[PDB]
């Protein structure tokens, strides 16, 4: 096949790209003894579609005149191989001098001549951190699909990182708004053991305090029963869920982990809580296929809403056919990509596409960079002011105030490099034997609810709440992970409420008595 060569094109300006186009098997992961290169020995199915989407966007931009009239846009694609060393070698190549094999060391780089205009970012968020801290020092603009962590928001460490997908923070803003609307003031919060769940717990634990929601208990939960302890601690988490008498659980984790938890909940029956876990869990088949799952009570979550580009599947099949045709072959970007057949990949995945979202994102990403160049060259309908070669740090000046269009959807980067985007609120309805994801709302910065379309298990609204101040004749006790709620005890007869701010009762003398909830000792 010609596929490994199809990932490159010439032009007046060139885009770099980092995609999950390959991987290496476990034997390669051993601690390296010598700085040899990495044998990324096998193909990857998703990266192929991401690369094809980038190619499609660039092809449309070259064919049309809505952007960059009169000049040609090229690209070079590299595989991340999910490996920081390979990612870093590929990243370093982008900054090398024009048409040259080396990179110069200088005190500052607002004086320099790198070989690409912008980088379409890596898939995984950890590689996004690793590569962003490097790229932004060169002030090269890097536009990333995926990579939703809030860490990359801060401009002081990542002055040049942009992304075309909403971050975790806005999703959790929507979640906390859902909690606020139904007065679910007293909740538990859980999260996976990776940085994804770590930052989920952290973001929620900050926003809830900022918005007056008291977390009953935190919790980091294991990925799977990989070791003898993890069969156990999940049950202690569930014991705390029952002891806190919570009804609503927030759970920011991937489906496999939630599936584990769910199965444990099923084993012991638990009780029908409400679960507000993330879309990664709301989407995954292996969860709703649990036969007993209706016992889980109630499932809610926010799912990202986005456009369609229907031409894409036919485009993939077209260029795979061209990759196979020797007449096209007769006319290095990924090794070993050429050895896997067309059919079981194309017909297998294209009939089964959250991975759809990343197509649109990877499309929109290119359209951002091109638009920025279109703005930086100050193009008229007829011509562009390309009398001088633009440098990457110049685009970064414009990218913050632009707006760009993608398939009749319209976008812009905010002051911290995100794009604002909207969600559906989808609840699982399973009075039908097959569980059905069902729309019951929308989030576009404030929560809109279609109250009628929600079927609570008892046909009545669940609640979990806590008293935020006690009455006069009551004794406080603080509760919550941040000491946020109070639970109140009526002070028993024969003792009295010492004073209206105490945490203690006080006995009355032998000769005298006090009513229940009294403040005084009386004849």
């Amino acid at each position: 096949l010609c596929l490994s060569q199809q990932f490159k094109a010439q032009g007046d300006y060139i885009l770099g790209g980092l995609f999950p186009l390959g991987s290496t098997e476990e034997a390669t992961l051993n601690q390296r003894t010598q700085p040899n290169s990495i044998p990324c020995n096998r193909f990857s199915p998703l990266g192929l579609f991401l690369a094809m989407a980038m190619k499609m966007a660039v092809e449309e931009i070259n064919n049309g005149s809505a952007l960059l009239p009169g000049l040609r846009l090229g690209y070079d694609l590299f595989d991340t191989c999910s490996e920081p060393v390979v990612t870093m070698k590929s990243s370093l190549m982008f900054l090398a001098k024009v048409g040259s094999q080396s990179i110069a060391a200088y005190c500052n780089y607002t004086q320099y001549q790198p070989r690409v205009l912008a980088v379409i970012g890596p898939h995984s968020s950890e590689l996004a951190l690793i590569t962003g801290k490097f790229f932004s020092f060169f002030l090269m603009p890097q536009v990333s699909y995926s990579a939703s962590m809030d860490r990359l928001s801060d401009r002081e460490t990542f002055p040049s990182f942009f992304r075309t997908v909403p971050s975790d923070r806005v999703q959790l803003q929507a979640v906390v708004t859902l909690l606020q609307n139904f007065s679910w003031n007293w909740v538990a919060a859980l999260g996976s053991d990776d940085d994804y769940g770590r930052e989920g717990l952290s973001i929620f634990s900050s926003l809830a305090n900022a918005r007056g929601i008291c977390i009953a208990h935190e919790g980091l939960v294991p990925q799977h029963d990989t070791s003898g302890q993890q069969l156990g601690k999940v049950l202690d988490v569930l014991r705390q869920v029952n002891q806190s008498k919570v009804q609503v659980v927030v759970l920011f984790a991937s489906a496999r982990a939630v599936y584990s938890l769910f199965s444990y909940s099923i084993h012991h029956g638990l009780s029908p809580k409400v679960w507000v876990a993330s879309e990664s869990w709301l989407t995954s088949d292996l969860v709703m296929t649990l036969p007993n799952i209706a016992r889980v009570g109630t499932v809610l979550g926010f799912l990202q809403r986005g456009a369609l580009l229907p031409e894409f599947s036919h485009y993939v099949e077209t260029h795979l056919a061209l990759a196979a045709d020797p007449a096209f072959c007769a006319s290095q970007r990924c090794p070993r990509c050429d050895d896997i057949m067309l059919q079981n990949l194309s017909s297998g995945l294209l009939q089964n596409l959250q991975l759809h979202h990343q197509i649109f994102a990877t499309y929109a990403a290119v359209y951002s960079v091109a638009q920025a160049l279109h703005n930086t060259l100050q193009c008229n309908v007829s011509h562009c002011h390309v009398s001088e070669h633009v440098l990457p740090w110049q685009l970064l000046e414009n990218m913050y105030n632009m707006s760009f269009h993608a398939r009749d959807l319209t976008l812009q980067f905010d002051a911290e490099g995100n794009v604002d985007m909207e969600y559906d609120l989808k609840m699982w309805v399973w009075q039908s034997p097959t569980p059905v994801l069902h729309t019951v709302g929308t989030f576009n910065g404030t929560l809109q609810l279609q109250q009628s379309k929600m079927y609570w298990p008892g046909n009545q609204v669940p609640v979990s709440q806590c008293s935020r101040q006690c009455k006069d004749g009551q004794v406080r006790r603080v509760k919550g992970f941040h000491s946020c709620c109070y639970d109140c005890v009526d002070c028993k007869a024969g003792s009295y409420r010492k004073h209206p701010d105490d945490f203690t009762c006080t006995p009355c003398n032998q000769d005298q008595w006090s009513p229940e909830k009294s403040t005084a000792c009386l004849p």
Binding site: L29, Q34, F137
Partner: protein, 501 residues
């Protein structure tokens, strides 16, 4: 100047001289002290003909701000004498200017440098970067440390709490990664040992020489109020030194008193905080830190960009007396790191202790040797764990404000190879008769009086009398009363039954 010395082989030094262009921020005393530690070590190697005869061990140094000015010095180190760094598939034959890097202090800077150096396997030794993830040699193959991990600091804190029976505590963390994960780690340890954590709060990361807004001030009030109202009189603080200057002032403003403050290594031995006289009135200050090792004569020595510091000398001269009066703790980490590189190079060149066969050294060849060094330096053996740590002892320092003798008195020692706290000494408390200060959720119950838990926290319980005809078999249960055998009866709250008609 202080920042360069030629030689046959260069070390690369990365030190944080300015806190907050990196030069424009306020200077740090400790950073210049550590830089002098490295310089003195290299001078000694050049004096010592027994270690590297006829070979000039040089050094080149660059200031790296707290989490800024990274990347640039790494490029300066890896680029060749023509200032160009060539891109290659395989770097086995490549020869950087420096042969080793004495890496940054902050963990995030250390990782930012490691993700770069792992590409070339340039050996990197970091002092004081305690983050636990740095043990992952799959992720950081070229990185070693001359200090124990954060695991051992948390273990020292927990065993200190166990010794004095402080099963009811409060934890404060800075609103950044260092605070966040250290609080997570302390919670993970605590839940396993029967200690209870009253609550956890996140401090705002206020700049010490900067004005404070209304909301930040109200946040500080909201935290210190929870401190004042809660029964837990032990407070553990995980924060960079910089942020705390504002916090404690507010604590002083609130008339707060009588707590035991447990400090993490990031501020446990900071002179700048110690010099605040009024901290005496907040209670007892304890902190976990690396051991003290007296260098032989360090004080008499202490008397293309970012390779300069103008303010360092005059700033440090104001602290010089307390610095000399204090011990040498992290200075030993820097000193032993340079000595580790020196021994590794000494054996790699195969020098015979009379003459050395000078050779082109590829960094990975030195990295594979730095793991096998095992030697005495000031009576301590230094050798590296398979995961990369040198197992230096930790010590617990009480803050003392008599300016005449010593600011940080060691009251305990901690052995990480044995994972045990030992040699606890006469701490002098704030209490009225020097009796050990106490924090517990609720006091131990009477005999014959069963427990009933009050909440999530295992430590908290009501005590309920067993009704007559039942007794509390203290040896077999705690939360219910056995019924007396039918031939016997019981006087309400009692552990036993009596024969009766």
């Amino acid at each position: 100047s202080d920042f360069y010395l030629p030689g046959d082989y260069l070390l690369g030094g990365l030190f944080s001289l300015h806190a907050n262009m990196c030069k424009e921020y306020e200077v740090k005393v400790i950073g210049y002290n550590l830089m002098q530690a490295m310089r003195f070590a290299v001078e000694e190697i050049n004096n010592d003909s027994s270690l590297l005869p006829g070979v000039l061990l040089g050094y080149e140094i660059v200031d790296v701000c707290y989490i800024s000015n990274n990347v640039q010095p790494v490029l300066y180190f890896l680029a060749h004498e023509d200032n160009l760094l060539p891109i290659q598939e395989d770097y086995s034959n490549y020869s950087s200017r420096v042969v080793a890097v004495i890496g940054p202090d902050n963990s995030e800077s250390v990782m930012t440098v490691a993700n770069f150096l792992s590409l070339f396997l340039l050996p990197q030794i970091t002092y004081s970067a305690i983050s636990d993830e740095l043990r992952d040699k799959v992720r950081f193959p070229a990185l070693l440390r001359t200090t124990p991990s954060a695991d051992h600091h948390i273990e020292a804190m927990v065993q200190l709490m166990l010794h004095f029976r402080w099963n009811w505590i409060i934890v404060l963390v800075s609103n950044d990664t260092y605070g966040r994960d250290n609080g997570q780690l302390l919670g993970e340890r605590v839940a396993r040992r029967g200690i209870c954590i009253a609550f956890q709060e996140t401090l705002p990361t206020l700049q010490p020489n900067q004005n404070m807004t209304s909301e930040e001030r109200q946040r500080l009030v909201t935290i210190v109020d929870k401190l004042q109202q809660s029964t837990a009189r032990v407070v553990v603080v995980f924060s960079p030194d910089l942020t705390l200057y504002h916090f404690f002032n507010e604590v002083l403003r609130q008339n707060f008193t009588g707590a035991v403050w447990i400090a993490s290594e990031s501020w446990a031995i900071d002179p700048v905080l110690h010099n605040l006289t009024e901290l005496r009135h907040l209670g007892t200050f304890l902190g976990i830190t690396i051991q003290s090792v007296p260098i032989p004569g360090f004080s008499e020595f202490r008397e293309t960009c970012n390779q300069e510091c103008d303010n360092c000398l005059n700033a440090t001269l104001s602290f010089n007396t307390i610095l000399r009066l204090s011990g040498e703790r992290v200075v030993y980490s820097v000193y032993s790191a340079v000595y580790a590189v020196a021994h590794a190079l000494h054996s790699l060149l195969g020098c015979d202790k009379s003459t050395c066969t000078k050779r082109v050294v590829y960094p990975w060849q030195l990295l594979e040797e730095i793991w096998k060094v095992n030697f005495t330096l000031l009576d301590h053996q230094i050798f590296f764990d398979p995961q990369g740590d040198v197992a230096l002892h930790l010590e617990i320092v009480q803050w003392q404000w008599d300016r005449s003798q010593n600011p940080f008195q060691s009251v305990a020692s901690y052995y990480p190879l044995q994972r045990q706290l030992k040699n606890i000494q006469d701490i002098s408390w704030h209490t009225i008769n020097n009796t050990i200060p106490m924090s517990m959720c609720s006091k131990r119950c009477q005999s014959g009086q069963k427990k009933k838990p009050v909440g999530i926290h295992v430590c908290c319980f009501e005590c309920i009398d067993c009704l007559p005809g039942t007794f509390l078999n203290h040896t077999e249960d705690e939360y219910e009363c056995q019924a007396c055998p039918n031939n016997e009866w019981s006087y309400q709250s009692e552990t036993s039954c009596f024969k009766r008609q």
